Structures are given as C-alpha cells and as structure tokens.
Amino acid sequence: ITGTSTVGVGRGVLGDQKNINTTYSTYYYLQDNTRGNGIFTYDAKYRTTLPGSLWADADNQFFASYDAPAVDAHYYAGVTYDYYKNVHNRLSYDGNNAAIRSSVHYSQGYNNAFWNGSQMVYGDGDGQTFIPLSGGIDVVAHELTHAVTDYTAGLIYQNESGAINEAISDIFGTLVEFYANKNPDWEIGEDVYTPGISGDSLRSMSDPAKYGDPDHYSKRYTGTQDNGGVHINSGIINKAAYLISQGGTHYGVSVVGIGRDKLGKIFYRALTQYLTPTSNFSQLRAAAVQSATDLYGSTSQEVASVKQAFDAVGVK
C-alpha cells in the first residue's frame, strides 16, 4: 500500500520485544519499505486462502497474543533479507528485490510452514508439536531460502535433489540464526518445537541421527514417504555442512573446520552457480569442491575440508 514508513513495536512469539518496520495509511500495516521492494506480512485468519489480508493494526503496537506470529514473521524476514544482501550481495530471493510476502495464522493447529511458490506461510502449531512457527528465525530463513533455491538451482523437491533443497534451507536457516546471534545453534526449529520438551529440536545438523535422520549416505532413505525422504536425507548434507564449518571426526574421517562464513560462501556459490534442478549428492560434492576452488584455490584448506566432509558422510 502507499503510505509513509513507520516503526512499530511489539512482542514476538517468545515474548521478546522488537521494533518492526510498518507503513501508515489510516492503519499501520506490516509493510517494511526499508528492504528491497518491501516485506509484507498478512493475516490468514486461521483459514487456508492465501495470502489473506495485509496485516493492519490501529496503533502501531503489536503486543497482543494474536500479533506475535506476525511480528516475528515480519521481523525475521527482514533479518533474512539482510543476511542475503549483506553477506551474499543478493537482493531478495530473486536477486532483484522481489517483494517478500508471508502469511501467518495459516489454518488451525497447523504444524508446519512452507513456501508455496510465491510466499511464505506459517502455521500456529497445535501448541504440542509447535508453537507459531515464525517464532523460529531458522524456520523463517529456512522458508525464505526455499524461494532462493527455487529462483537459482531450482532443485526438484524429491529424492536427492530434494534433500539438497532441504539441507540448503537448513544450512542457510542456521547461518541466518548465527547472523542474528541470539541463542544460535546447529539445531533446526528448537525455538518453536515441542514447548513441553526442553532441549530438543525438529532436526539436528550437528548430529542428525539424534532425531533419526541419516548422517551417512549408507543410511539414506530410499522409500517414497516425505517426497523420497527430503527432510530425512537432508541430514547427510546437513552433517557434511556442519563438518565443513565446525570440523570433527565422523565415522573415523577427520574434517578440519573452516568456519560458518566460508561454509556459507561455498554453499551459496554452489547453489547459485553450479547446482541444477536435478543435482544429486555426488553432484553437490562436485559443486561444493568447485565453489571452494573458485573462492580459495585448489590447494586450499577449504577445498580439502569440503572433500573430507563429503568423505565423512559417504558421498563421493
């Protein structure tokens, strides 16, 4: 909408106060004009018609319980935009400052979030498996990264290419979480998953097997559930990424860690310059090796560590 840029204040899902960029025109709308061609957050009002209505608020104060998922979807989309712009010189998900749209309060008791091809969508959770999912910065960044993937490598959402797609979203979700630097970890969704259980998460990149996901290619899922295991076999790539960044010895293979920033550079380059819609894990290894070679040189530690990490997870 046309209006003037304003700054509201509110509380997120976890009860933390934050400022949000809004737009004033009669109402204060969750429309952040400070980033690209805008970040827009919508109320799906417990229904499934999308996007719903651009979030309107009378007073620019967003402290109601109903407001909290919108506050966080809006704010964390901003953080994610900043990560891609500041760290990777990428302007929004399409590289041309496409408007970023999110809807919250999607459906009833909805234990998921997704990119629907055009926008991000967040359930509120059922209060048992999840609280409103936009409360997780890694979740928000995971979802926006799906849009980045779809505009770049285009990894088909099934089997190995789909597991790479998932891992890319977990990797950049985690790197955005570290970028914001509030309780960062290599776990996925811990801030919104299972409010009645402390210390768990939906997935772990550092130890995927803690939640039943494979951490070695020899343990990959080959069945048909979950689009051929896209959220399962992502553990193999997540583990490789964790090892590249943090190092470790895994199934006897030692990996010299090179840190998060270089992980992000290598995988961003792989995603945007080498991966294709049909890339498999072996092709991801090759893309990551080539990306590290481009960035750091063929004889570099970074290239050696990429190879070690993929070796450690059984991907040649």
Ligand X SMILES: CC(C)C[C@H](NP(=O)(O)CNC(=O)OCc1ccccc1)C(=O)N[C@@H](CC1CCCCC1)C(=O)O
* Residue numbers annotated as active site: 143, 231
Strands 113-115 and 53-54, bridge-based pairing: unpaired
Cα radius of gyration rounded to whole Å, the chain: 19
- Binding positions for Zn ion, 156-185, rule CB under 5 A: 169
Binding site annotation covers 193? yes
User: Using CA atoms, how far apart are residues 156 and 51, in angstroms rounded to an integer?
Assistant: 24
**Backbone gaps in the chain, preceding residues (C–N over 2.5 A):** none
Pick 41 or 169: Cβ nearer Zn ion? 169
Q: Which stretch, 19-27, 58-66, 140-148, 250-258, contacts ligand X (CB under 6 A)? A: 140-148
Q: How far is the CB of 52 from ligand X (least distance, A)?
A: 16
**8 A C-beta contact, residue 54 and residue 30:** yes
Q: How far is the CB of 194 from Ca ion (least distance, A)?
A: 3
CA-closest candidate to residue 131, choices 196, 52, 74: 196
Kindly tell me which residue out of 100, 133, 287, 313 binds ligand X, with binding defined by CB under 6 A: 133
Binding site annotation covers 187? yes
**8 A C-beta contact, residue 123 and residue 143:** no
Strands 203-204 and 248-250, bridge-based pairing: unpaired
Binding site annotation covers 185? yes
Site track 71-110 with ligand X (rule: CB under 6 A), x = hit: ----------------------------------------
User: Using CA atoms, how far apart are residues 228 and 67, in angstroms rounded to an integer?
Assistant: 36
CA-closest candidate to residue 263, choices 201, 202, 196, 173: 173
Q: How far is the CB of 238 from Zn ion (least distance, A)?
A: 12
Type of residue at 240:
A
Q: Total binding residues for ligand X by CB under 6 A?
A: 19
Kindly tell me which residue out of 35, 74, 101, 142 binds ligand X, with binding defined by CB under 6 A: 142
Q: How far is the CB of 61 from Zn ion (least distance, A)?
A: 33
Cα separation values, 224 from 172, 187, 227, 229, Å: 26, 25, 6, 7
Binding site annotation covers 59? yes
What size, in residues, is the chain? 316
Question: What six digits make up the tokens of 139?
Answer: 């979740």
Q: State the residue number with the nearest CB to ligand X.
A: 114
- Residue 270: DSSP 8-state: I
Binding site annotation covers 150? no
Does residue 202 interact with ligand X by CB under 6 A?
yes
Kindly tell me which residue out of 24, 27, 46, 114 binds ligand X, with binding defined by CB under 6 A: 114
Q: How far is the CB of 220 from Zn ion (least distance, A)?
A: 18
Binding site annotation covers 72? no
Give 3's strand partners: none
Type of residue at 49:
T
Does residue 200 interact with Ca ion by CB under 5 A?
yes
Does residue 157 interact with ligand X by CB under 6 A?
yes
CA-closest candidate to residue 160, choices 214, 223, 228, 114: 228
Binding site annotation covers 110? no
Pick 70 or 266: Cβ nearer Ca ion? 70
- Residue 146: DSSP 8-state: H
- The binding site comprises 57, 59, 61, 138, 142, 146, 166, 177, 183, 185, 187, 190, 193-194, 197, 200
Residue numbers of the site for Ca ion (CB under 5 A)?
57, 59, 61, 138, 177, 183, 185, 187, 193-194, 197, 200
- The binding site for Zn(2+) comprises 142, 146, 166
